[PDB]
Write an enzyme that holds these catalytic residues in place. Structure first.
Site, short mmCIF file in Angstrom:
data_model
loop_
_atom_site.label_atom_id
_atom_site.label_comp_id
_atom_site.label_asym_id
_atom_site.label_seq_id
_atom_site.Cartn_x
_atom_site.Cartn_y
_atom_site.Cartn_z
N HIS A 202 1.12 -2.66 -5.98
CA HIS A 202 0.60 -3.90 -5.81
C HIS A 202 1.95 -4.99 -5.91
O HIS A 202 2.14 -4.99 -7.33
CB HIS A 202 -0.62 -4.09 -6.66
CG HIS A 202 -1.05 -5.67 -6.25
ND1 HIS A 202 -1.99 -6.02 -5.28
CD2 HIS A 202 -0.85 -6.76 -6.78
CE1 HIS A 202 -2.03 -7.12 -4.89
NE2 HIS A 202 -1.54 -7.89 -6.03
N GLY A 203 2.51 -5.47 -5.03
CA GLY A 203 3.47 -6.03 -5.02
C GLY A 203 3.16 -7.85 -4.86
O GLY A 203 2.01 -8.11 -4.26
N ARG A 218 -7.74 -9.79 -9.28
CA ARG A 218 -9.01 -10.51 -8.68
C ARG A 218 -9.44 -10.65 -7.45
O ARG A 218 -8.45 -10.98 -6.71
CB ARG A 218 -9.06 -11.88 -9.50
CG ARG A 218 -9.17 -11.86 -11.07
CD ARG A 218 -8.26 -12.99 -11.65
NE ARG A 218 -6.86 -12.79 -11.48
CZ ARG A 218 -6.05 -13.60 -11.14
NH1 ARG A 218 -6.21 -15.13 -11.33
NH2 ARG A 218 -4.79 -13.42 -11.09
N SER A 240 4.20 -2.59 -0.16
CA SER A 240 4.12 -3.34 -1.34
C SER A 240 5.20 -4.59 -1.50
O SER A 240 5.23 -5.64 -1.81
CB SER A 240 3.65 -3.10 -2.47
OG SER A 240 2.24 -2.38 -2.36
N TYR A 243 5.58 -7.89 -0.01
CA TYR A 243 4.89 -9.17 -0.70
C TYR A 243 5.59 -9.39 -2.01
O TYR A 243 5.10 -10.13 -2.75
CB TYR A 243 3.65 -8.64 -0.76
CG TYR A 243 2.61 -8.40 0.52
CD1 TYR A 243 2.21 -9.18 1.28
CD2 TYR A 243 2.77 -6.82 0.82
CE1 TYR A 243 1.49 -8.93 2.56
CE2 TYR A 243 1.93 -6.64 1.97
CZ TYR A 243 1.47 -7.34 2.82
OH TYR A 243 0.74 -7.03 3.91
N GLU A 332 -3.03 0.30 3.94
CA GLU A 332 -3.84 -0.54 2.95
C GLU A 332 -5.19 0.11 2.62
O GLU A 332 -5.98 0.39 3.19
CB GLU A 332 -4.06 -1.82 3.76
CG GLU A 332 -2.76 -2.37 4.43
CD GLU A 332 -2.83 -3.83 5.03
OE1 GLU A 332 -3.67 -4.59 4.64
OE2 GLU A 332 -1.96 -4.53 5.77
O1 LIG Z 1 0.23 -11.89 -3.16
C1 LIG Z 1 -0.31 -11.55 -1.96
C2 LIG Z 1 -0.46 -10.12 -1.36
C3 LIG Z 1 -0.15 -8.99 -2.37
C4 LIG Z 1 -0.27 -7.86 -1.53
N1 LIG Z 1 0.37 -6.77 -2.32
C5 LIG Z 1 0.14 -5.41 -1.85
O2 LIG Z 1 0.76 -4.66 -2.56
C6 LIG Z 1 -0.22 -5.16 -0.66
C7 LIG Z 1 -0.34 -4.03 -0.25
C8 LIG Z 1 -1.02 -3.91 1.09
C9 LIG Z 1 -1.58 -4.84 1.76
C10 LIG Z 1 -1.35 -6.21 1.28
C11 LIG Z 1 -0.96 -6.21 0.13
N2 LIG Z 1 -0.73 -7.70 -0.31
N3 LIG Z 1 -0.58 -12.60 -1.08
C12 LIG Z 1 -0.54 -14.11 -1.35
C13 LIG Z 1 -1.72 -14.70 -1.34
O3 LIG Z 1 -2.69 -14.72 -2.77
C14 LIG Z 1 0.16 -14.75 -0.23
C15 LIG Z 1 1.53 -14.08 0.09
C16 LIG Z 1 2.58 -13.52 -0.71
C17 LIG Z 1 3.54 -12.70 -0.06
C18 LIG Z 1 3.67 -12.57 1.24
C19 LIG Z 1 2.73 -13.02 2.23
C20 LIG Z 1 1.74 -13.71 1.77
#
Ligand SMILES: O=C(/C=C/c1nc(=O)c2ccccc2[nH]1)N[C@H](CO)Cc1ccccc1
Length: 350
Positions: A202-203, A218, A240, A243, A332
């Protein structure tokens, strides 16, 4: 004059706590989301203002399914933006609407880290104060234990990172911390009978690491993605790492990634985006949007975590011919209840 107690943290944990509470890192994140930090400082950020911004977005959501210009002007008054002193772009697409919702989910996690650092009266009525980094560490209510390079799980995690990381631009491993969110142990107990446990990536933004260490991963009412309203994970580090929003620290670019123990139970596999999901189909415990590749399952290993066996992928991504035809390049992994995840590791990558 109050005595400041010496820091009890090791250099690597000191650096981590400095970075995830860094006011400059938080202001940088707001600049990268086009926010006006002067008209909306970290000290002025409020839950009411963020709630008001979500209300404006909920109103804009209806108008897509009062003009879009009027409703956008109201959102930009509640949540101030910086756009080279030009007309702000109207929120007239479901993509620009979800972008502003993602921006507010980040900002709410920034506010959380700000509210957390608030100096209470019970702290003001003590003659000796903890070192600033010890105080911030303690506010997390999360045990962080730096892993030794010789521990067996250190080598298992390193292999996972190296084998599933981006082929050329491979992230360099700096530190691994064991995460024990004191509150997450009792909620995960309500899934003890659920098998098929896997360690997944989870990035995230550096600006939300503090909020995750305090509250876990959450499902917020306005979150979503290609597989609906759940917690998103990957079996491939390179997926991951996309992100991971890091920050410039000297010559290097420092970022943080989580490893979570996910109780997947019975899996429902899909090969097409479904942004309307809010749960798996009946009888299933997770949804997996299957990628073109998957870390070679022959190379899977296991870790023993709190008496339970957890699968840890160790192989390089290899084709999944059944899912050659999939709208997902990389898988995913989705859970639709927060209790099905347990944060286990935190990684510092350059
Ligand atoms: O923090 C995240 C997403 C973390 C995430 N982290 C993942 O490790 C991941 C792996 C597979 C599919 C989706 C995934 N999404 N999104 C934010 C909304 O709260 C916005 C965002 C952050 C980074 C890039 C694009 C959008």
């Amino acid at each position: 004059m109050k005595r400041v107690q010496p820091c009890s943290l090791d250099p690597a944990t000191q650096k981590l706590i400095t970075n995830i509470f860094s006011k400059e890192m938080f202001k940088n994140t707001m600049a990268l989301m086009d926010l006006d930090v002067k008209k909306m400082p970290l000290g002025k950020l409020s839950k009411q203002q963020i709630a008001r911004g979500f209300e404006a977005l909920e109103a804009l959501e209806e108008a897509l399914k009062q003009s879009l210009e009027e409703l956008s002007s109201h959102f930009y008054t509640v949540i101030p933006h910086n756009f080279g002193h030009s007309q702000p772009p109207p929120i007239n697409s479901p993509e620009l609407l979800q972008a502003k919702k993602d921006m507010l989910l980040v900002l709410a996690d920034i506010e959380l880290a700000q509210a957390l650092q608030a100096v209470s009266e019970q702290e003001k009525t003590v003659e000796e104060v903890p070192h600033p980094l010890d105080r911030d560490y303690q506010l997390l209510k999360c045990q962080l234990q730096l892993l030794d390079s010789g521990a067996p799980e250190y080598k298992v995690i390193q292999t996972y990172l190296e084998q599933t990381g981006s082929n050329h631009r491979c992230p360099t491993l700096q530190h691994i911390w064991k995460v024990n969110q004191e509150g997450e142990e009792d909620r995960f107990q309500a899934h003890s009978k659920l098998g098929n446990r896997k360690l997944l990536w989870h990035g995230t933004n550096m600006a939300v690491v503090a909020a995750i260490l305090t509250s876990g991963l959450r499902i917020m009412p306005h979150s979503g993605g290609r597989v609906g309203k759940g917690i998103y994970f990957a079996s491939e580090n390179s997926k991951s790492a996309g992100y991971v929003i890091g920050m410039k620290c000297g010559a290097h670019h420092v970022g943080y990634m989580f490893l979570g123990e996910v109780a997947l139970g019975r899996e429902h596999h899909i090969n097409t985006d479904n942004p309307s999901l809010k749960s798996p189909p009946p009888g299933f415990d997770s949804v997996i949007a299957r990628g073109h590749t998957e870390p070679d399952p022959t190379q899977d290993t296991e870790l023993e975590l709190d008496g339970q066996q957890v699968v840890v992928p160790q192989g390089q991504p290899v084709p999944c011919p059944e899912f050659s035809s999939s709208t997902f390049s990389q898988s995913e992994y989705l859970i639709y209840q927060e209790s099905q995840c347990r944060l286990r590791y935190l990684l510092e990558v350059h």
